Amino acid sequence: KLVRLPGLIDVHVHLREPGGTHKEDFASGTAAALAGGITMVCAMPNTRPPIIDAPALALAQKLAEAGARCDFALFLGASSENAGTLGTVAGSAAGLKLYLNETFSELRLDSVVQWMEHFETWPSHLPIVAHAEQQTVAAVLMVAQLTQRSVHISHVARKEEILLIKAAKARGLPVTCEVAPHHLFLSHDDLERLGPGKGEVRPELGSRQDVEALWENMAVIDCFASDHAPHTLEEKCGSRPPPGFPGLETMLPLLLTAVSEGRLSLDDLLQRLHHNPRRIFHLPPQEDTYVEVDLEHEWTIPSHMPFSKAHWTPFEGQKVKGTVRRVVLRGEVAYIDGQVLVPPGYGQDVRKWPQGAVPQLP
Amino acid sequence: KLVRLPGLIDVHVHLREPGGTHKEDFASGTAAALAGGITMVCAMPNTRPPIIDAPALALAQKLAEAGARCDFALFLGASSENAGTLGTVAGSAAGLKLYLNETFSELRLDSVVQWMEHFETWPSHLPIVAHAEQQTVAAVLMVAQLTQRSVHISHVARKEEILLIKAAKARGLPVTCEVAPHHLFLSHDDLERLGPGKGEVRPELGSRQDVEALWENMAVIDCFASDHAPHTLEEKCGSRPPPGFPGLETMLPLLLTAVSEGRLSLDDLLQRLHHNPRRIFHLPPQEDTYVEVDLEHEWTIPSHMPFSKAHWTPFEGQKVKGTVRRVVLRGEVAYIDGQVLVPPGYGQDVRKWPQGAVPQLP
Ligand SMILES: [Zn+2]
Numbered sequence: 139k140l141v142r143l144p145g146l147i148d149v150h151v152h153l154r155e156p157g158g159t160h161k162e163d164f165a166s167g168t169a170a171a172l173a174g175g176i177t178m179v180c181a182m183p184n185t186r187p188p189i190i191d192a193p194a195l196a197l198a199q200k201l202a203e204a205g206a207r208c209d210f211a212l213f214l215g216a217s218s219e220n221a222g223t224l225g226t227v228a229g230s231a232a233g234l235k236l237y238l239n240e241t242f243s244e245l246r247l248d249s250v251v252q253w254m255e256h257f258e259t260w261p262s263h264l265p266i267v268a269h270a271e272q273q274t275v276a277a278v279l280m281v282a283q284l285t286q287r288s289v290h291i292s293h294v295a296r297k298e299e300i301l302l303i304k305a306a307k308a309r310g311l312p313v314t315c316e317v318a319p320h321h322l323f324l325s326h327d328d329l330e331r332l333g334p335g336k337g338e339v340r341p342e343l344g345s346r347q348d349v350e351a352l353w354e355n356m357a358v359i360d361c362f363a364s365d366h367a368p369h370t371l372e373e374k375c376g377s378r379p380p381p382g383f384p385g386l387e388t389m390l391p392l393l394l395t396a397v398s399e400g401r402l403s404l405d406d407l408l409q410r411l412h413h414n415p416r417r418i419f420h421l422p423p424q425e426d427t428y429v430e431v432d433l434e435h436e437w438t439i440p441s442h443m444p445f446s447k448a449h450w451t452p453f454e455g456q457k458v459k460g461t462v463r464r465v466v467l468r469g470e471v472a473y474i475d476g477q478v479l480v481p482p483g484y485g486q487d488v489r490k491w492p493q494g495a496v497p498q499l500p
Numbered sequence: 501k502l503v504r505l506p507g508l509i510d511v512h513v514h515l516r517e518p519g520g521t522h523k524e525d526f527a528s529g530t531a532a533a534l535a536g537g538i539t540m541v542c543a544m545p546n547t548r549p550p551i552i553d554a555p556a557l558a559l560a561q562k563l564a565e566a567g568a569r570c571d572f573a574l575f576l577g578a579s580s581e582n583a584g585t586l587g588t589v590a591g592s593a594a595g596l597k598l599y600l601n602e603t604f605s606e607l608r609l610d611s612v613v614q615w616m617e618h619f620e621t622w623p624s625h626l627p628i629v630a631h632a633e634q635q636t637v638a639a640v641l642m643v644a645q646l647t648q649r650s651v652h653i654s655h656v657a658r659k660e661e662i663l664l665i666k667a668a669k670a671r672g673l674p675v676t677c678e679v680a681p682h683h684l685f686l687s688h689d690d691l692e693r694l695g696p697g698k699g700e701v702r703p704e705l706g707s708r709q710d711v712e713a714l715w716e717n718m719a720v721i722d723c724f725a726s727d728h729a730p731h732t733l734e735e736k737c738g739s740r741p742p743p744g745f746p747g748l749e750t751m752l753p754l755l756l757t758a759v760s761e762g763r764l765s766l767d768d769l770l771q772r773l774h775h776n777p778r779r780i781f782h783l784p785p786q787e788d789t790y791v792e793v794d795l796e797h798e799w800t801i802p803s804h805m806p807f808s809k810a811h812w813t814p815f816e817g818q819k820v821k822g823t824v825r826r827v828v829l830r831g832e833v834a835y836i837d838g839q840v841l842v843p844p845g846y847g848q849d850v851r852k853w854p855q856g857a858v859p860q861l862p
């Protein structure tokens with residue numbers, strides 16, 4: 139007996155196109171999404187070139203429309219040069235992303251004053267997301283208060299961070315956050331097995347106490363999102379390992395295992411992979427769209443999942459219970475038992491749908 | 501014709517006793533203070549042992565009462581172990597100091613949650629000061645708002661920081677700040693001359709644009725304070741140079757030069773070295789206490805000033821106009837033209853004066 143879920147949404151994926159297509163592209167990344175029960179993704183802007191102006195966004199939109207197999211929205215990225223310049227294209231994007239810790243030259247912000255300028259200039263009704271670790275979470279929360287608006291904090295990984303967000307919410311501040319599966323299901327205890335190269339991710343893997351704190355504070359977590367950050371094994375095992383893990387194909391199976399063990403409910407899961415992503419990012423419903431999962435099937439995560447070009451996974455060897463059996467996207471069968479059945483280009487930009495525009499005052 | 505000033509206050513000095521007395525002690529540091537026209541100092545807690553509990557404070561109080569030549573108050577320091585333990589001695593201290601960036605093991609805080617615990621437990625009517633650089637200023641401001649109280653930011657050094665504080669003040673937040681003379685009178689342009697060892701200080705020397713921003717934003721600066729941080733030349737020129745500059749003997753001459761050039765007024769100076777320190781830290785007046793200065797005398801800063809055991813200065817070679825001629829402290833001549841005339845032990849703990857206790861609700 140299969141369980142029918144709505145079409146799940148991952149608001150944080152790196153699909154590497156343009157410019158890193160050996161790591162992943164729209165076609166491979168969205169195949170990975172569908173196999174993981176995800177029917178809509180929001181793609182991050184740290185591509186090459188990065189999506190930091192209108193021409194780069196226009197290119198990315200066409201690459202996505204031609205390559206995506208599931209539906210999508212594309213983030214714009216904040217730079218040291220583009221505050222006050224994105225107003226005409228802002229509404230066509232998923233939102234604006236600020237990289238406040240380690241980043242590529244083009245997305246580096248060298249001053250909190252630049253963060254303020256973005257919060258002041260980006261349209262007030264549109265989403266802003268920050269990669270912010272440790273005290274940077276407190277800092278960007280301050281900037282959000284000074285500019286009187288909301289902020290979404292990406293991949294919370296530490297007890298310190300989730301307790302700070304909890305305290306902010308207790309004071310009624312408009313902050314939401316997400317947590318990635320590797321910060322719920324891996325810790326320092328796994329670095330031995332992974333090694334210093336594969337184990338490289340940002341935010342870094344937490345202690346057992348960090349992991350326990352995130353579970354204890356599940357009520358504070360608004361969304362789950364993969365931070366799918368594909369890099370090849372050659373890159374991860376090399377001399378200058380880039381941070382990041384692939385995660386689209388493993389996220390839902392890991393979380394379904396946790397549901398089966400009673401660590402959270404099916405509803406808790408659907409709030410965090412469907413309802414809260416919709417409401418925070420103003421993402422539209424998808425008609426005739428659903429995912430069928432088998433909660434009984436026990437399997438072991440292999441050395442690589444079938445679709446991501448990353449061709450490795452940090453969850454290798456973990457036992458899971460829960461499998462995606464079928465995905466239907468807008469009335470077409472998109473995935474069955476290991477086979478993707480919609481072509482590159484089937485996916486659409488949800489921000490171009492009438493129901494996908496963010497409502498605003500005239 | 502000499503100008504009579506009130507007794508000036510430096511709220512940020514490191515006098516190194518106990519535990520670093522080769523660098524400075526209470527007797528030498530307060531001689532330096534008097535020679536710089538300073539009649540009251542607030543001593544920082546990063547001594548050895550650091551002033552992080554009642555026994556250490558008790559020892560420091562006796563060392564100061566025996567050695568100080570001018571009046572003083574002593575800070576307590578926040579640690580990872582002492583939140584909630586300082587209530588009985590808190591009122592006897594200048595305030596509580598948090599070291600939020602680089603620090604010794606004992607004063608290191610590893611989580612913003614620890615900062616919050618201190619803001620929640622330290623008595624609400626007593627001062628809290630933070631060493632906070634760059635985004636750390638935004639972070640500690642957030643903690644101050646979450647806990648609904650004030651904070652004083654030490655040595656603001658950058659355009660980024662002063663503009664952040666300016667924006668916070670425009671929103672009516674209870675934040676004050678101070679700037680040190682090296683961040684007004686030295687910059688990157690001086691690193692050539694100083695070298696990488698002598699030039700080591702935290703916050704680091706700013707760009708010319710940072711320096712210009714602090715002057716342009718003088719209205720935002722509540723206090724001047726030296727951050728007198730004596731280290732010997734051997735230490736500064738050695739393989740692991742500690743950060744910090746000596747500054748008590750040079751601060752007032754540098755600032756008087758700026759007054760003579762019309763860069764700020766005499767009143768602007770007295771607000772920042774007398775009135776605002778009194779009101780922010782609830783420091784009492786000193787009876788029959790005053791400083792006589794000569795604003796006409798031009799001289800060149802030598803390779804070392806007479807009193808600090810640091811026996812070097814980063815201002816060597818700068819031309820100044822303005823000299824301290826006489827200091828009277830509580831009715832006794834304390835300093836005349838290069839000679840200190842009150843003995844170690846003349847100085848008193850102002851927090852023990854009836855007028856030096858901080859008023860509170862019963
Ligand atoms: Zn990130």
Ligand SMILES: [Zn+2]
Pocket residue numbers: 150152182365367
């Ligand atoms: Zn990311």
Ligand SMILES: [Zn+2]
Pocket residue numbers: 631654655702703727
């Ligand atoms: Zn400091």
Ligand SMILES: [Zn+2]
Pocket residue numbers: 512514544727729
């Ligand atoms: Zn200091």
